[PDB]
Amino acid sequence: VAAVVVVGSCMTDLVSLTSRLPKTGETIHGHKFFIGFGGKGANQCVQAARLGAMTSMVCKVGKDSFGNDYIENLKQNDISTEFTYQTKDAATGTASIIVNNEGQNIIVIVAGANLLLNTEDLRAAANVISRAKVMVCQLEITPATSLEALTMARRSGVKTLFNPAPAIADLDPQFYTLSDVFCCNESEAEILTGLTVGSAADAGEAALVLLKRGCQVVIITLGAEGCVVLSQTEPEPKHIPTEKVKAVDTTGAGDSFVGALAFYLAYYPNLSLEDMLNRSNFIAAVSVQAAGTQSSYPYKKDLPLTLFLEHHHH
Amino acid sequence: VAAVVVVGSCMTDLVSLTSRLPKTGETIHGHKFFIGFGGKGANQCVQAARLGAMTSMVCKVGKDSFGNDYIENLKQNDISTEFTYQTKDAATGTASIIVNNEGQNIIVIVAGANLLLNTEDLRAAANVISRAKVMVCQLEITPATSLEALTMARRSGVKTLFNPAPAIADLDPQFYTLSDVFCCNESEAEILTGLTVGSAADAGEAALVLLKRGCQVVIITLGAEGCVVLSQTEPEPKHIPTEKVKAVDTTGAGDSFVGALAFYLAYYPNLSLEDMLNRSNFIAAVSVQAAGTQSSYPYKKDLPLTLFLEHH
Numbered sequence: 350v351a352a353v354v355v356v357g358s359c360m361t362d363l364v365s366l367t368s369r370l371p372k373t374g375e376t377i378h379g380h381k382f383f384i385g386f387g388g389k390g391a392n393q394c395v396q397a398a399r400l401g402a403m404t405s406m407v408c409k410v411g412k413d414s415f416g417n418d419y420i421e422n423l424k425q426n427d428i429s430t431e432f433t434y435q436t437k438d439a440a441t442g443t444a445s446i447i448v449n450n451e452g453q454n455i456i457v458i459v460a461g462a463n464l465l466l467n468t469e470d471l472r473a474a475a476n477v478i479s480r481a482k483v484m485v486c487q488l489e490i491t492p493a494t495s496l497e498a499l500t501m502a503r504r505s506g507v508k509t510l511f512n513p514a515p516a517i518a519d520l521d522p523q524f525y526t527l528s529d530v531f532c533c534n535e536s537e538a539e540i541l542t543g544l545t546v547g548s549a550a551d552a553g554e555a556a557l558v559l560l561k562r563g564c565q566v567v568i569i570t571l572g573a574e575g576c577v578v579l580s581q582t583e584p585e586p587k588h589i590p591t592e593k594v595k596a597v598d599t600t601g602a603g604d605s606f607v608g609a610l611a612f613y614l615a616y617y618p619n620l621s622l623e624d625m626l627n628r629s630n631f632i633a634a635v636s637v638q639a640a641g642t643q644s645s646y647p648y649k650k651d652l653p654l655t656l657f658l659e660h661h662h663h
Numbered sequence: 664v665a666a667v668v669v670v671g672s673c674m675t676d677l678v679s680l681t682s683r684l685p686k687t688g689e690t691i692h693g694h695k696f697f698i699g700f701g702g703k704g705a706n707q708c709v710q711a712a713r714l715g716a717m718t719s720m721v722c723k724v725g726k727d728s729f730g731n732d733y734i735e736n737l738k739q740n741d742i743s744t745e746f747t748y749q750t751k752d753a754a755t756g757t758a759s760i761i762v763n764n765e766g767q768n769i770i771v772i773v774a775g776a777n778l779l780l781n782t783e784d785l786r787a788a789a790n791v792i793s794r795a796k797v798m799v800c801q802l803e804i805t806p807a808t809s810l811e812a813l814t815m816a817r818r819s820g821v822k823t824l825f826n827p828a829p830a831i832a833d834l835d836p837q838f839y840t841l842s843d844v845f846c847c848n849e850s851e852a853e854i855l856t857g858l859t860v861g862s863a864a865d866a867g868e869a870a871l872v873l874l875k876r877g878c879q880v881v882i883i884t885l886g887a888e889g890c891v892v893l894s895q896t897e898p899e900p901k902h903i904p905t906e907k908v909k910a911v912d913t914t915g916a917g918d919s920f921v922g923a924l925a926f927y928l929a930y931y932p933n934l935s936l937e938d939m940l941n942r943s944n945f946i947a948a949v950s951v952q953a954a955g956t957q958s959s960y961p962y963k964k965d966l967p968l969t970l971f972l973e974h975h
């Protein structure tokens with residue numbers, strides 16, 4: 350049994366390294382190309398699996414080489430692929446990424462097969478969703494499919510962790526009311542609320558607007574400032590800082606955070622939210638110390654033992 | 664036995680279709696992704712093979728899934744892959760292409776394995792090159808390998824067709840003196856000559872500079888305006904127009920043209936140059952009426968009978 354079930358996206362990353370970013374109408378040469386594995390849903394599932402979660406990815410990829418290779422990436426990370434569907438009717442989702450020597454980029458995302466994950470696929474996954482401890486979803490599949498997954502999870506008493514990423518300004522109200530944990534970043538929170546979110550203070554105001562739409566718990570992640578949390582039972586904002594580290598590459602840090610939080614929700618339910626967030630921050634900040642999105646996510650064996658204690662730790 | 668040997672590039676085209684092109688630091692979403700098969704060398708080879716040429720593609724790809732798929736693309740088009748190599752040391756060459764709804768694009772090319780096609784790889788193809796009628800090269804592999812290929816062909820009395828694409832201003836002079844037929848587009852002629860090329864007349868002036876640098880025949884393609892040709896024996900420029908068509912997608916039209924020219928030089932050696940160029944304009948103009956690159960290249964069975972008749 351998979352205790353963390355991620356209903357969401359997989360994307361093949363097609364990355365070209367250049368010295369300068371091209372403009373409209375330009376052809377340029379780069380010096381290296383390589384392929385990597387991304388998608389917010391797969392990223393989150395990877396982090397939770399590497400911490401020791403029994404995970405399953407509910408997703409759709411193409412009946413194509415990229416899709417086959419994605420399946421193998423999931424397997425290599427000890428993720429169940431029992432609900433990794435394929436389709437003849439769309440290509441695997443892609444992210445075509447051009448990167449310069451300073452790490453600035455142009456990204457073109459084509460959702461592809463991710464949008465064909467459908468009701469009938471969710472119905473086939475009903476038992477796996479219902480038997481989980483946590484169901485995680487984002488907004489890189491059809492929003493209605495995410496909503497159906499939240500609905501199914503809630504009907505089974507399964508904890509719902511919703512990551513509205515990338516954000517949409519006007520979400521169906523049920524996105525809020527069906528979310529036990531609503532987790533977003535500063536820029537997302539700006540889009541959802543129409544407010545500036547630069548600081549922890551600003552995040553507390555944004556988070557309260559989100560809480561009042563019917564979330565049980567709101568978390569806004571804040572980069573190097575950690576995160577801010579509020580809940581229905583404790584609506585005063587709590588700012589949970591992260592220790593200073595030397596960041597190499599922050600890409601994917603949010604997905605690291607969310608995957609770690611899903612792990613702790615499923616495996617350490619006894620812990621307070623604050624303790625779960627302290628630990629999640631730590632893991633995410635480990636990921637920012639290395640290049641390469643999924644390749645940067647740490648494994649349990651590489652992490653401090655104190656992150657896995659059953660009790661509250663000073 | 665191969666009558667047309669192409670020594671040149673294979674590139675996997677990774678294409679995203681969008682409504683707008685992205686700026687620095689922007690993530691945008693497009694509506695379709697697909698993989699296509701490109702590279703000037705392979706494109707020219709595919710066109711000549713579709714016309715009925717027996718062809719051999721001398722090239723290098725990765726020992727990777729793209730490379731295996733490229734090899735299958737060449738086989739599907741009936742092209743010999745005897746001297747299509749694979750290497751562990753680089754990935755198959757790539758073009759990551761973003762195209763908006765008005766057809767404007769951003770292209771990032773990583774040549775990759777194409778650059779690792781070396782003189783030893785080419786030497787192994789000596790018997791096939793010596794038995795060919797036409798050798799075709801471009802500027803998408805390492806210069807030393809293409810110069811050696813043109814050298815081999817000359818030693819065997821094999822007609823050389825050189826496409827200086829993409830063009831470089833400081834072109835090695837041997838590319839002129841080793842080319843029996845030198846074919847480039849307007850923007851390429853500008854780069855090579857420093858002259859502005861915005862009409863058929865301008866093209867004739869640029870072509871004459873190329874001729875005096877040591878080419879035997881110079882052809883400048885001109886898009887919808889067809890092409891201009893001059894030669895040592897007939898140095899007066901001849902403008903050869905193409906009938907008006909409704910273009911769907913002109914990508915790869917130059918490679919269709921060059922591939923068709925290679926076919927005619929190999930299989931219809933008795934036709935005049937002017938007749939070959941009329942026929943090659945017609946075939947390229949077919950290619951512009953279909954979307955894509957290689958998928959737009961027409962097959963013999965789909966073309967007018969007159970294009971395959973032994974005489975004018």
Ligand SMILES: Nc1ncnc2c1ncn2[C@@H]1O[C@H](COP(=O)(O)OP(=O)(O)CP(=O)(O)O)[C@@H](O)[C@H]1O
Pocket residue numbers: 533534535570571572573574575576591592593594596599600601602603604606629630631633634637
């Ligand atoms: N510079 C930094 N130092 C320490 N921790 C960091 C950090 N940047 C991010 N984190 C950690 O990662 C978590 C997620 O951050 P956030 O959601 O802002 O990342 P992100 O995925 O949007 C970065 P990117 O835009 O580059 O992908 C934070 O709550 C924090 O725990």
Ligand SMILES: Nc1ncnc2c1ncn2[C@@H]1O[C@H](COP(=O)(O)OP(=O)(O)CP(=O)(O)O)[C@@H](O)[C@H]1O
Pocket residue numbers: 847848849884885886887888889890905906907908910913914915916917918920943944945947948951
């Ligand atoms: N709009 C059009 N109508 C008819 N024939 C066309 C055409 N565009 C190109 N061609 C044919 O293709 C040949 C090669 O054209 P050229 O070398 O200019 O192509 P290209 O691959 O550089 C695309 P473009 O011409 O749009 O820049 C021309 O000589 C002509 O025969």
Ligand code: NA
Pocket residue numbers: 514534603604
């Ligand atoms: Na995120």
Ligand code: NA
Pocket residue numbers: 598599600601602636637638639640641642645
């Ligand atoms: Na990282």
Ligand code: NA
Pocket residue numbers: 828848917918
């Ligand atoms: Na060309």
Ligand code: NA
Pocket residue numbers: 912913914915916950951952953954955956959
């Ligand atoms: Na075309």
